[PDB]
Amino acid sequence: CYLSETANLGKLICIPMALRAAMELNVFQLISKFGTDAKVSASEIASKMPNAKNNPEAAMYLDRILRLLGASSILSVSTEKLYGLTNSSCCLVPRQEDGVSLVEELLFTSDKVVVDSFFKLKCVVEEKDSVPFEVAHGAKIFEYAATEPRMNQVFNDGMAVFSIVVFEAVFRVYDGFLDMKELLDVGGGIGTSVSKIVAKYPLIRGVNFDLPHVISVAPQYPGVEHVAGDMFEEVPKGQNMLLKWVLHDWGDERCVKLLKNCWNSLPVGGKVLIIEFVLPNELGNNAESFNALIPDLLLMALNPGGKERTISEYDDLGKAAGFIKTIPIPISNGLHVIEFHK
Amino acid sequence: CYLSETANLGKLICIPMALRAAMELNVFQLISKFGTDAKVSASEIASKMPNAKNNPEAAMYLDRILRLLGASSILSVSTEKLYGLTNSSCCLVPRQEDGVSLVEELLFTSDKVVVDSFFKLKCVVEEKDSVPFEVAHGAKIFEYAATEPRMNQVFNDGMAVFSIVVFEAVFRVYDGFLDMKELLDVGGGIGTSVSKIVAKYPLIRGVNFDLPHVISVAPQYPGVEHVAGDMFEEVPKGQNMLLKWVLHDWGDERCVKLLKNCWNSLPVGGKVLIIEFVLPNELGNNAESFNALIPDLLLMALNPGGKERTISEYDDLGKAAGFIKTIPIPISNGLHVIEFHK
């Protein structure tokens, strides 16, 4: 009956926006600053909030946003209501170690520019060659970013803090980093990714490869030697090559051409490591299943032409260039490390 | 484990914006226009979209979206993917009788002018007397809606549909109407409510009562006398009064005067009927909880004066006006008739 689905389906938008506002207001942190498995009032949390000081009602409005995150299991409740951090609410407290937390990723996935793009998802389907983001902002995404600092930050801050947790995950399972001479990181960005590798495997020689306009600003890393160029023209010579989140940006023709350029500048007895989220064929309310789908949608909103992929499809791509024995390694919740051997 | 909490919290934004594009692309009617327990595929669904006749990749993208819906169980999945309506997917298919769905309501809860307002939920906690809608748009809700047809209509079409399903329930459960001659709808707008009531119970002389400019347009219905005026000044005399989704738009001191004025124009054994979704005293992942939270959020966003309330709070209000019996009557998933007996 309807008055069922008015709640089931009507909560769907309400939760993320309530979460977002909580993140924006620190909440998840200010709560942790009180203790281990602690349990706090709205009136308290708002008391540890500078620009609330001037607002009386600060208390009651916060209690209304929180009880939603409560009922959502995103927070935990006791009785004046008392909220406390949860398993999948701890990823929102920045570590005292660095400052890391899922916050920066999530504030990006749900940014007005991402959602305003989603608000036009119905266009990939109706109009051929429509870019939701373009339809939504009337600029090529890279044009927009060039003139929109806040948008640029949010994207970079996000795919970084993310990349970190993605790498901590690979520096836990994967062993293949022991017994490497050099990795050549393709579309390596400004080298951070590999910087990380060089420092936990000094055994390795670091080559960051990306476009000249990128490389020119890349910081200087011990082990990381930068090299500018067009990976679609020619990847540089090397033994081990990284492709973390590069193939999902690109189609099939183009994905091959890059994977080809890698075979060439790679010796026999040597592999291209490809760090991705592999799309199961059995999609379910699995984090396996959802870690592929989130990007697919983001990829449809921001990059009509990219796509996440099933282990079947990587193996088709990473073979029509001339590889064999594509050895996929499960890492966590879908993070595979599809090895492409020459 | 981060890489787990990146889907649980990550999906929270994608699902809604997917459902939207789905409803918008008209996916739930087309899967139905196939059969009863039909399992259909993007390729076919696409060919039914006359707008997607000329966008080759049409199907490919629809598939990419519908996947995300399958995972979350809006749709149902099988093996190419084949999807079909479900209990929920169903409540988004316009009925043979009336053309009614949750669609119009869910397309409003998630409309851009509402999300935009959600993207300032935090303002309610910080800046005192702040109204996210106003922060986000410049205008007050009504200023904006008078110069913005598309928004105005979306809001009507949603409030419309919601009422229809909300009553169908009331009437399946509440014995009180059979046993009434006069019903005065206080804040009835164009009195579409007190019509539905009189139409099903024609021994009732209905009175619809709202402000001149509202009443100034209401149409004419059999068994309904319209009456212009200001409920917070005087309320017309009447055997019984209805107050559907009124109390919740106002704060305690101002609900009390409205209910006072009501108690002043009632005979003894007269009663105010309060139709609200009621805030449970302990919340959870239950339709009784969200059916109260969703509106309590939309309020903070669009009218922060308004709140949802607990049966005990509604009772305190009534008693303040000098009624003397509160009979809470559960209807469905949190929906109530609360009777204030004079």
Side-chain angles (χ1 to χ4, degrees), chain A residues 19 22-23 26-29 32-33 66 69-70 72-77 83-84 86 88 90-91 94-95 100-103 106, chain B residues 1-2 6 8-9 12:
Chain A
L19 176 65
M23 283 171 163
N26 217 4
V27 170
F28 300 123
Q29 171 169 297
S32 74
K33 276 200 197 303
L66 287 174
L69 289 167
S72 311
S73 280
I74 303 195
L75 268 179
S76 80
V77 258
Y83 316 85
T86 137
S88 237
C90 270
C91 314
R95 310 196 294 206
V100 172
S101 65
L102 276 187
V103 161
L106 282 186
Chain B
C1 152
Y2 289 130
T6 72
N8 306 149
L9 312 190
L12 297 187

Side-chain angles (χ1 to χ4, degrees), chain A residues 3 5-7 10-11 16 55 61 64 67 88 91 110 116 119 124-126 128 290-291 296 304 306, chain B residues 3 6 11-12 51 55 61 64 67 110 112 119 126 290-291 294 296 300 304 306 333 335:
Chain A
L3 288 211
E5 287 341 68
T6 61
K11 73 186 171 188
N55 182 311
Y61 290 132
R64 283 161 68 172
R67 61 156 156 254
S88 237
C91 314
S110 77
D116 285 0
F119 257 125
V124 297
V125 180
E126 289 193 328
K128 139 270 217 333
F290 273 142
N291 275 345
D296 220 55
Chain B
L3 271 271
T6 72
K11 73 191 171 201
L12 297 187
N51 319 270
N55 169 18
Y61 289 125
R64 303 199 48 180
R67 293 221 284 256
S110 110
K112 186 149 179 275
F119 273 124
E126 309 181 325
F290 282 144
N291 268 348
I294 296 156
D296 186 36
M300 281 171 71
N333 300 298
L335 181 50

